[PDB]
């Protein structure tokens, strides 16, 4: 039985078929999960995420249960294996948004129901799936390859993009400040994968180098939740995405941001609003992708 | 152009009355008119009574509600409202919002692909007034399409929305509040203008008993209006003569009904005796918000372009 | 019109038929409450409980409304009769998990809709029903009787096990520390009921005596919620009372251990023994679903 904790556990073919299914569903919605149930466990609230999941299962014919931070104190009252052995036995799927990946792993270990990583400090795979869906929608996938730049932290988003690029065969440039490092274990996995898929990966500390010859620019907040700051902002001096920065990329390149955005920091107001349409489709598109993911996990029991 | 429901000011006599009639049809013969449709409910300050009405309204109509709470959703505290609007408003069919500040509703509506519904703001509480109206009609206190109504209380949202609705509908309304208290001039002007068209007999005073003369419907509300709770002790003293009690109801017409949006504070704006004397109507009032939100949601579904 | 506030208000026959119905429903699920609604009022959150009820009504064809602690402040803003007379008139059932039983009573008194006691300081009947379901599933009900030991506090669980054993005709031994007493009013009810049903009830302060010739051992947390301002003292009082391997050894062969959860390994129960019984303890947990289903269908017919 398969969980969905990271795209690392999936094939190029599997990932692409999730995006194609999403697309079919967006076009022609079907109630493929009649009466199925999804428990949603949040350790830290995210309205954007919740919407995506709640609506995903709902539209597919099922029901969602929202168990919040207040509602559900994980590893703070009862142990996780206990919670897993009750909740994971009563519902068809469990999504979790967690502070720490270990928690997902520990839950999955004892969950009869497939567990979905709605966000952890290591990986944010649903988001990348949505980003991907969006790239395809905006016809920025020439030749099954995408030429992508990621600018920001060595955070979860970076990890997941690095990985996915590696699996899919994308050309990706990553840019973060000089003092910032990427996990050697993750990096190794990507190196291996690139060999098989022909990925052109590069990692640096120069925004403008990363941006050269790119059709898709991806950025993210610098001050990550919980990790709140004043010193960090000063470290990300050159790193804002602005008009001059987008100029360096290819003509008509799209800007993606997972949100929320902090105008005047990782992104300028002008440039952000310049790309409202794509940024907010991006936000919404997580729906179609979670749908696909849920149908998929339902068939891999 | 697509219509939101932020205040009754934006609607015609005919429109409001047809919402009530529809509510009534639905109460008689429930129908699932919004199959699969979705309603985001955003609360900035929790109201269980409201939530019930909306949740059940859409549910019974065949749809699904999403409750996003205060804890869940921090508006204008993290991300700007236009950003939220451009996500949430794009994914759901309707968005209801209970807000601290009306501007927030306006700003959201401005960016929402989905019709936004004012579940309560500091200026207006229209879904409540619709329910009050429904109730007045059910209790056969709308002789001649007109109603003879007294509103006693603060210059709060409820007052505004009664003033307005009276104005649109052509009702005869007397408002009573303390001497120092005023109604927003902008709102008052609208009402003056609307009365001309509709023949509303509107009067504002500071004498409970005058307001009450020849009335079939007495409406009151809490004095310490929500949020303004840092100022309560003072407000109470100002509302000395203003409680609705047996003697006060005596001044109104025979068999006049007492309406209160709830919750009620026995011993303040209303006496225990009198409140309980009207439990049947008051609690039907409570419940009747359901049918009215149903109508409203059907109505906004049909007015998308 | 009948509410479900304690098993005290039901007959042996009524209780057994709830368990039987549950069992039918587990076997063959049916949507017997199409479109019906359940308001769930929590004064203190319990995820385990919520799941049970939310899924019960949902699977039965209805809808749940979760009103939380933050959402709904009971007897702290508006009076309860007012709440009851709004909520209880818009939904088909009301479950409540409350700090104080009186609150259920007061609500029920003004609720058009049947109220269900999802847990109070006095009684936890839905849990006992589930326990019962589970005992029957693990074939530990020889001759319609069960031989049961309850070890723990004089809490809600104890009250409800005492009562139910009394109604049903079970043989039950209860063990708690010396200083601890059962509510005389509850105890007196049980005494009376045992006479009618032939219950073999005994109360002591000796874990091992309680355990002798038992097929079911039941335990529970010692630090009961709310009473957390007094904990350090309580733990010391419960020295001999943990359920461990040696304790289970005293009971009959293949005897099952039940715990309503959550559990505090190293206290009322040892890690080893708890995990030894994971399968039954977690079926126990899950089985609350089928029983709440039964209960809801039952209350739908007793209007």
Curated annotation (Swiss-Prot), chain A:
Q: Does Lipid metabolism appear among the keywords?
A: no
Q: Does the keyword Lipid metabolism apply?
A: no
Q: Which GO terms describe its biological process?
A: arginine biosynthetic process via ornithine; citrulline biosynthetic process; L-arginine biosynthetic process
Q: Which Pfam families match?
A: OTCace, OTCace_N
Quote the function comment for this protein.
Reversibly catalyzes the transfer of the carbamoyl group from carbamoyl phosphate (CP) to the N(epsilon) atom of ornithine (ORN) to produce L-citrulline, which is a substrate for argininosuccinate synthetase (ArgG) involved in the final step in arginine biosynthesis.
Which InterPro entries is this protein grouped with?
Answer: Asp/Orn_carbamoyltranf_P-bd, Asp/Orn_carbamoylTrfase, Asp/Orn_carbamoylTrfase_sf, Asp_carbamoyltransf_Asp/Orn-bd, Orn/put_carbamltrans, OTCase_ArgI
Give the location in the cell: Cytoplasm
Describe its partners and assembly state.
Homohexamer; dimer of trimers.
What are the entry keywords?
Answer: Amino-acid biosynthesis, Arginine biosynthesis, Cytoplasm, Transferase
Major place of residence: cytoplasm
Species lineage, top-down?
Answer: Bacteria, Pseudomonadati, Campylobacterota, Epsilonproteobacteria, Campylobacterales
Q: What is this protein called?
A: Ornithine carbamoyltransferase, anabolic
Q: Which gene encodes it?
A: argF
UniProtKB/Swiss-Prot annotation, chain B:
Q: Does the keyword Amino-acid biosynthesis apply?
A: yes
Residues that, per the record, bind carbamoyl phosphate: 47-50, 74, 98, 125-128, 261-262, 289
- EC top class, in one word? transferase
Q: Name the positions where L-ornithine binds.
A: 157, 221, 225-226
Which cysteine pairs make disulfide bonds? Answer: none
Mind telling me which GO cellular component terms the entry cites?
A: cytoplasm
* Entry's Gene Ontology BP terms: arginine biosynthetic process via ornithine; citrulline biosynthetic process; L-arginine biosynthetic process
- Which E.C. number(s) belong to this protein? 2.1.3.3
Keyword line? Amino-acid biosynthesis, Arginine biosynthesis, Cytoplasm, Transferase
> Where does this one sit in the cell?
Cytoplasm
Q: Which domain of life is it from?
A: Bacteria
Q: Which reaction does it catalyse?
A: carbamoyl phosphate + L-ornithine = L-citrulline + phosphate + H(+)
Family classification: Belongs to the aspartate/ornithine carbamoyltransferase superfamily. OTCase family.
State the function annotated in the UniProt record: Reversibly catalyzes the transfer of the carbamoyl group from carbamoyl phosphate (CP) to the N(epsilon) atom of ornithine (ORN) to produce L-citrulline, which is a substrate for argininosuccinate synthetase (ArgG) involved in the final step in arginine biosynthesis.
Spell out the subunit comment: Homohexamer; dimer of trimers.
**UniProt name for this protein:** Ornithine carbamoyltransferase, anabolic
Q: Which organism is it from?
A: Campylobacter jejuni subsp. jejuni serotype O:2 (strain ATCC 700819 / NCTC 11168)
Encoding gene, per UniProt annotation = argF
UniProtKB/Swiss-Prot annotation, chain C:
| GO annotations of cellular component type | cytoplasm
Q: Which GO terms describe its molecular function?
A: amino acid binding; ornithine carbamoyltransferase activity
Record flagged with keyword Protein biosynthesis? no
Biological process terms from the Gene Ontology for this record are: arginine biosynthetic process via ornithine; citrulline biosynthetic process; L-arginine biosynthetic process
Entry-linked InterPro entries? Asp/Orn_carbamoyltranf_P-bd, Asp/Orn_carbamoylTrfase, Asp/Orn_carbamoylTrfase_sf, Asp_carbamoyltransf_Asp/Orn-bd, Orn/put_carbamltrans, OTCase_ArgI
Residues the entry annotates as binding carbamoyl phosphate: 46-49, 73, 97, 124-127, 260-261, 288
EC class of this enzyme? transferase
Q: Where in the cell is it found?
A: Cytoplasm
* Pathway involvement of the protein, from the record: Amino-acid biosynthesis; L-arginine biosynthesis; L-arginine from L-ornithine and carbamoyl phosphate: step 1/3
Q: Where does L-ornithine bind?
A: 156, 220, 224-225
**UniProt KW Cytoplasm keyword:** yes
Catalyzed reactions per annotation? carbamoyl phosphate + L-ornithine = L-citrulline + phosphate + H(+)
Its family remark reads: Belongs to the aspartate/ornithine carbamoyltransferase superfamily. OTCase family.
Function field: Reversibly catalyzes the transfer of the carbamoyl group from carbamoyl phosphate (CP) to the N(epsilon) atom of ornithine (ORN) to produce L-citrulline, which is a substrate for argininosuccinate synthetase (ArgG) involved in the final step in arginine biosynthesis.
On subunit structure and binding partners, the annotation says:
Homohexamer; dimer of trimers.
- Protein name per its UniProtKB record: Ornithine carbamoyltransferase, anabolic
What organism does the UniProt record list as the source? Campylobacter jejuni subsp. jejuni serotype O:2 (strain ATCC 700819 / NCTC 11168)
Task: Identify the coding gene.
Answer: argF
């Amino acid at each position: 039985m398969k969980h969905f904790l990271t795209l690392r556990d999936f094939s190029k073919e599997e990932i692409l078929s999730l995006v194609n299914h999403a697309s079919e569903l967006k076009k022609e919605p079907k109630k493929l999960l009649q009466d199925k149930t999804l428990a949603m466990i949040f350790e830290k609230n995210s309205t954007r995420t919740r919407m995506a999941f709640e609506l995903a299962i709902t539209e597919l014919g099922g029901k969602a249960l929202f168990l919040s931070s207040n509602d559900l104190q994980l590893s703070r009252g009862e142990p996780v294996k206990d919670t897993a052995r009750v909740i994971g036995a009563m519902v068809d799927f469990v999504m979790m948004r967690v502070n720490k990946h270990e928690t997902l792993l520990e839950f999955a270990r004892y969950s009869k129901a497939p567990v979905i990583n709605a966000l952890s400090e290591l990986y944010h795979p649903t988001q990348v799936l949505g980003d991907l869906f969006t790239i395809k929608e905006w016809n920025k996938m020439q030749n099954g390859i995408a030429k992508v730049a990621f600018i920001g932290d060595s955070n979860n988003m970076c990890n997941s993009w690095l990985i996915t690029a590696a699996i899919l065969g994308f050309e990706i440039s990553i840019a973060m400040p000089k003092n910032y490092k990427i996990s050697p274990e993750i990096w190794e996995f990507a190196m291996k994968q690139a060999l098989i898929s022909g990925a052109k990966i590069s990692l640096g500390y120069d925004k403008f180098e990363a941006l050269k010859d790119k059709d898709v620019v991806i950025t993210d907040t610098w001050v990550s939740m919980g990790e709140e700051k004043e010193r960090k902002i000063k470290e990300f001096e050159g790193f804002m995405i602005d008009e001059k920065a987008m100029s360096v990329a290819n003509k008509d390149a799209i800007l993606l941001h997972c949100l929320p955005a902090y105008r005047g920091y990782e992104v300028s107001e002008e440039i952000f609003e310049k790309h409202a349409d794509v940024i907010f489709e991006e936000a919404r598109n997580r729906l179609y992708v979670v749908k696909a993911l849920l149908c998929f996990l339902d068939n891999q029991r």
